[PDB]
């Protein structure tokens, strides 16, 4: 092919990434709630 | 007696070149080192 450059060269940005989470066995769910009384303290209860 | 006017193209398939073709002297120019801004792009991407 009579080209000045003998070999085609490409320079790809190569990116690798590995990551984990490491969560324990627990209940960040429903228990993650705002103050039960909130603004409804008018409702009477002692056992709740 | 003959009197008329005509206008003709420069048939750019055959003619129309014969000029500097400003592609060159700029394509052989910095297009490689300017592309080599991949270094700076990789730098910014690393901290991105």
């Amino acid at each position: 092919w009579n080209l000045d450059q003998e070999n085609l060269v490409s320079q790809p940005r190569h990116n690798v990434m590995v990551k984990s989470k490491l969560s324990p066995e627990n209940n960040i769910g429903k228990t993650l709630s705002v103050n039960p009384f909130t603004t409804a303290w008018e409702l009477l209860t002692l056992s709740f | 007696d003959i009197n008329f006017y005509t206008r003709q193209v420069i048939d750019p398939r055959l003619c129309g070149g014969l000029a500097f073709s400003p592609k060159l002297n700029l394509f052989r120019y910095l297009d490689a080192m300017s592309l080599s801004w991949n270094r700076s792009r990789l730098k910014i991407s690393r901290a991105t």
Side-chain angles (χ1 to χ4, degrees), chain A:
Chain A
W1 289 4
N2 201 348
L3 291 178
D4 65 321
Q5 177 58 224
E6 51 89 14
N7 190 3
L8 169 56
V9 179
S10 159
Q11 281 295 2
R13 190 266 298 270
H14 190 120
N15 183 4
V16 303
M17 182 285 317
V18 60
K19 59 186 295 301
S20 68
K21 182 67 173 66
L22 310 189
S23 71
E25 193 73 26
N26 52 1
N27 286 95
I28 298 89
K30 187 260 291 180
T31 57
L32 183 68
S33 68
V34 301
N35 62 6
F37 63 92
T38 307
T39 192
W41 183 246
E42 76 258 17
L43 61 83
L44 306 170
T45 176
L46 184 58
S47 68
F48 182 76

Side-chain angles (χ1 to χ4, degrees), chain B residues 3-34:
Chain B
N3 166 257
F4 73 99
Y5 175 88
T6 45
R7 186 175 67 231
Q8 186 64 40
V9 310
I10 54 155
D11 58 18
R13 173 63 276 156
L14 182 63
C15 195
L18 292 75
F20 174 81
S21 180
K23 323 298 309 183
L24 61 83
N25 203 6
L26 182 57
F27 265 99
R28 60 138 293 286
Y29 185 73
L30 301 190
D31 287 336
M33 61 79 71
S34 68

Side-chain angles (χ1 to χ4, degrees), chain B residues 30-39:
Chain B
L30 301 190
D31 287 336
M33 61 79 71
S34 68
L35 168 74
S36 80
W37 84 285
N38 287 32
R39 284 160 309 112

